[PDB]
């Protein structure tokens, strides 16, 4: 149950930044966000991993914080990962 409090809620400004940091992820690395999303959001498992629609409104804070922290491993630890 601590998982619900351990995860901090992602605000609008943040979900925006998130959608922008996800947009920074290269095709191979962004298949992970689709995967994190599809897996953590089994309600969108009908969606294909190469055709995913990251719905930041349906994405749980957990997924969003994961997506965000995930991209940061590729973005805030490496400049332009598609270069």
């Amino acid at each position: 149950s601590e998982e619900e409090d351990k995860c901090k809620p992602m605000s609008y400004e943040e979900k925006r930044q998130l959608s922008l940091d996800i947009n920074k992820l290269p095709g191979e690395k962004l298949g992970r966000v689709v995967h994190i999303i599809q897996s953590r959001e089994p309600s969108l498992k009908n969606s294909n991993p190469d055709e995913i629609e990251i719905d930041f409104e349906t994405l749980k804070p957990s997924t969003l914080r994961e997506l965000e922290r995930y991209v940061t491993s590729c973005l805030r630890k490496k400049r332009k990962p598609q270069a």
Binding site: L18, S19, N23, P26, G27, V33, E53, D55, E57, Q82
Partner: peptide, 13 residues
Amino acid sequence: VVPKKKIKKEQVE
């Protein structure tokens, strides 16, 4: 509302 991210292959910028 944050716009739904359309990930239709090759969306990296």
